[PDB]
Amino acid sequence: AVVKCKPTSPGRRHVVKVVNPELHKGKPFAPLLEKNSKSGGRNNNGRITTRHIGGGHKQAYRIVDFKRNKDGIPAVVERLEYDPNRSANIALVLYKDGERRYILAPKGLKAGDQIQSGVDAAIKPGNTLPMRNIPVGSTVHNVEMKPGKGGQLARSAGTYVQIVARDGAYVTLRLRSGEMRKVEADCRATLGEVGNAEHMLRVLGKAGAARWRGVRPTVRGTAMNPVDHPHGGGEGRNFGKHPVTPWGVQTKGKKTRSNKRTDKFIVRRRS
Amino acid sequence: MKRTFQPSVLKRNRSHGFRARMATKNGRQVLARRRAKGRARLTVSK
RNA sequence: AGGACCGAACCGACUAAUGUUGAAAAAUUAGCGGAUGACUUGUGGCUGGGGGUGAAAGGCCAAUCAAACCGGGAGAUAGCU
RNA sequence: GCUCGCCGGAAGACCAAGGGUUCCUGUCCAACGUUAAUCGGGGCAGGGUGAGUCGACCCCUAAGGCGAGGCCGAAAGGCGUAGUCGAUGGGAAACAGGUUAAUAUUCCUGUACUUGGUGUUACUGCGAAGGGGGGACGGAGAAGGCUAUGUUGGCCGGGCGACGGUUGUCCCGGUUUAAGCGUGUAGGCUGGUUUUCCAGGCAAAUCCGGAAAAUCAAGGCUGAGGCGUGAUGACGAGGCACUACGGUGCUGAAGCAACAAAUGCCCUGCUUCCAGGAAAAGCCUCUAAGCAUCAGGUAACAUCAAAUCGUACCCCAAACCGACACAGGUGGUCAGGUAGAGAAUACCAAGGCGCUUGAGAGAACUCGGGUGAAGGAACUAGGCAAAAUGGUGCCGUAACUUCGGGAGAAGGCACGCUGAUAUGUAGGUGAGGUCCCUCGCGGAUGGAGCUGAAAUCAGUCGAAGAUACCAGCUGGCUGCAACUGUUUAUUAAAAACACAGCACUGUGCAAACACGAAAGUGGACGUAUACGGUGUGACGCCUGCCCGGUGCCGGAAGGUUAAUU
RNA sequence: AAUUCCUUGUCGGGUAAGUUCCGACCUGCACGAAUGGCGUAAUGAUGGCCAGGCUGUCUCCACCCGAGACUCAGUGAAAUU
RNA sequence: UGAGCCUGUUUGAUGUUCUAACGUUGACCCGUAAUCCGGGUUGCGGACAGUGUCUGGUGGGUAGUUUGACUGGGGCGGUCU
């Protein structure tokens, strides 16, 4: 649900929250945790290579299963959980042989449901099959790009992909950007779409909210001196030049892709 | 008012010590220069 | 509940007087702002000079910065005093 | 030696970092000490630091560093695997009294605890570089149980007062005791036991995870305080005999109860929120290769061991960082009384100091302060500086508004002391005595003793009762930036920077982009509801016309055009 | 008008007297729509103007309490020439 | 399908197909007690991609420098045979 806050303070006047009562209140499953340290945007030379990163809350990593092997064994859903590393919720599942795992939670999945993977599974949300075995015209998420590698497309909150055609050993997909693409028909996918579709209806409200997530302030190039940026200088407010990046490359229109190795798999670029 | 020099033995020894000088090719050149000049104290280590 | 209110410890530096071969190569006395947060503090670590870092003042990098310090080319050149 | 003054959340006491003999005793006054010096942190000589339990060393890892083979690079060299280092974090064990001129949880007296090696006896399936458990973790809030510690009464010893009174409802002092061992309470969490089966934990498993039956309803873990012992002991005002002025030998009274009460402990607990809150070992279990007469495991006794380095002194300062015996800077711990909301402020306790030139006089002028007839901003660029308001309870309070605010708006009234209601009220705490029951640190009744607000009525003193310290000035019209925040260390704190929100554009993952001759690394253990660049800057109503010039995006017919031949 | 040279433009308000201030007119030297246009409650050690209380800021200065300046004894500098 | 020689031969261009050079930051086995490295088996690409030498375009991202004299001061104006 989406809730507005009341204006008891100027920092609270403009806050909208997404509240979900079905998420677990407790500690996560321990045998599937690891430590994760912060970088500040620095590489092994010690230099800043990506700007505006630093600080925030401490987080631990949850091992999620993007391969979805283990065909033939049904699994049941135990609970849904909050994860600080991504923008989608996760789910804990228990197999009939006594094994536990974390998976991405689709839309409409509760506690007490069943799921399966393999060539001879049913067509229902949460099940996994190779795309050679899925009817054309379907909506899927968590799609592989090589057989046996793991999902790499449509993993964010509310996203999905469409199967548009099949021809020979390949299938054609429509992606969220508007692109049409080709992939081998032996790849795997999951039925449905990713949940938590209200994630984009939240307003942060104050600068500290962005600071809580590890984001540092942005300084405009027009406010610097000529020795710092191509946009600096002036007696007052002056621009008089075509906008460029901090390293002298034109922004606002120029294209940048160059990869002749993969050009045979793009059918039509995004419009 | 706070000033520039604030002592610490561990940091002193990790920065300018004998083993630090020996760990690198230029530090050995510092040691050779000082030996050729004939200094009574070669490094900061006691 | 809150980048909420009044106010000590703690962190700052808006006004005036003194001081200017000072008690002090930037301070003292009387007032002043924040004070559960984008807060403050101890120990260790990483980024090196046409390079770093910068909520951006050409600011800071050991009382030195529109290109640090030390040694060398070196007795640079000086139609000038 | 007697009097006076100053600090007392410090200007007292104990440490880490840093320094290194400044510590104690004898002797000297040339130089050092902003003056004299018989004195000194000065010169000279001698003395002083005692550990199985405090620290370091040692076992274990974080950020990061180095790195056999390896990949890459004109040389020099760069990055990295198996490994090995690195605390600011995890890992066994000790208390009270006495003593030196100078050391003490180390020396002496009394009473304790922990980890290993070897031997004897009695029972017995042991075994890891591997599997499982544990260690093991955020912010804020509330109120119940306690202790440190304080006040008063009872008890014991002493006193009867330099000037009116003081055998009493009077005055002064003391009333202290640990670790360990036994008991398992206020309280928190969790159903217990047996049998059978199984695509999981690389292989195995009696251990963990999962499924199906029967049976019992009470089992288990954690836990402050109090009580007993330790203690017929030690300490203790004072007395019996001399003093080297530091002290010796002996003796030695009382040593209880009530109330108030922490920011400390139960609490790594409980309730709630989103920004979702370290690693490895020590420790408890499970088996594999292997050994099974052996070796090994559990318990009881006897004996041996626990090495090496630090330990003096200063530590908000004359011993550290500032060239100085410099009005500056420097992290942790302890927290008495009266008034007070308080760690503010005033006066005191234990304890520590009067800051290393003095003595006179009482001119102009300069510095820091107190008071002012009549007027009340006439001063000045400008009410600059000064003067003024200031507490608690109650009455009462406008335009405008994003409905939260504006608001402590503005402007008012009461306030000391003594008596009664009530020889101390409403509340709080709680002993004897009487019953109940598995019998205990139990339940019900009961009210002695102690402690104790606020209000109303009638009186009374002064010019003044929030009497000292402490402690908001208020209202009306307008420019700029929505707001909390940031910045020119040392003449500029602002309308400048950032910000939540909005829009354009790039980017299909070996992503775009950035650091790198390269190998590689960040972006990210992320995947278009994601990530990078550019401009505007909460919110409300909005954002018109121009593609001729310079950029960017698409086209490919015609003209011009490189190496090469 | 943080924008207007001519300019102290012209009219109204506030004062005994107002080149600054508030409300209007339009002759915009040389405003104007994300190098954004017009508004806006709350907030500000931010710029401008008017009131009450208060006063040694002032007419115009007078007295007092402390630290120096002055005299005695000890020590004992500086810029410049 | 266009050019040379006596239908056949030599040599260009365009378009399908193939595997054996080359790529793999897909899966499995070993060195091994190892998310680096090498070898082996198997999928997917495939003479494309990528690197060396030569060559045309773009290139204030970075570097080395030039930007005259007379003159009732200099600049603006005028001038220099």
What key attributes describe this structure?
part of a larger assembly, 2 chains, A: 271 residues, mainly beta, OB fold (Dihydrolipoamide Acetyltransferase, E2P), Ribosomal protein L2, domain 3, 7-stranded antiparallel beta sheet, 4-stranded antiparallel beta sheet, 1 helix, 15 strands, B: 46 residues, mainly alpha, Helix Hairpins, 3 helices, 57% helix, elongated, RNA-binding, ribonucleoprotein (chain B), ribosomal protein (chain B)
Summarize the structure in words.
Chain A: This is Large ribosomal subunit protein uL2. Chain A: Residues 38-47 have a biased composition (Low complexity). Chain A: InterPro entries: NA-bd_OB-fold, Rib_uL2_dom2, Ribosomal_uL2, Ribosomal_uL2_bac/org-type, Ribosomal_uL2_C, Ribosomal_uL2_CS, Ribosomal_uL2_dom3, Ribosomal_uL2_RNA-bd_dom. This is part of a larger assembly, with chains A (271 residues) and B (46 residues). By secondary structure, chain A is mainly beta. Chain A folds into three domains: 1-113, OB fold (Dihydrolipoamide Acetyltransferase, E2P) (Beta Barrel), CATH 2.40.50.140; 117-194, no CATH class; 195-271, Ribosomal protein L2, domain 3 (Irregular). Chain A is 2% helix and 23% strand. Chain A contains one helix and 15 strands, in the order E-E-E-E-E-E-E-E-E-E-E-E-E-E-H-E. In chain A, a hairpin with a 5-residue loop joins strand 12 and strand 13. Chain A starts with a strand and ends with a strand. Chain B is mostly helical and 46 residues long. Chain B has a single domain, classed as Helix Hairpins (Orthogonal Bundle), CATH 1.10.287. Helix content of chain B is 57%, strand content 0%. Chain B has three helices and no strands. The chains are: A mainly beta (271), B mainly alpha (46). The chains hardly touch. The structure holds four RNA strands.
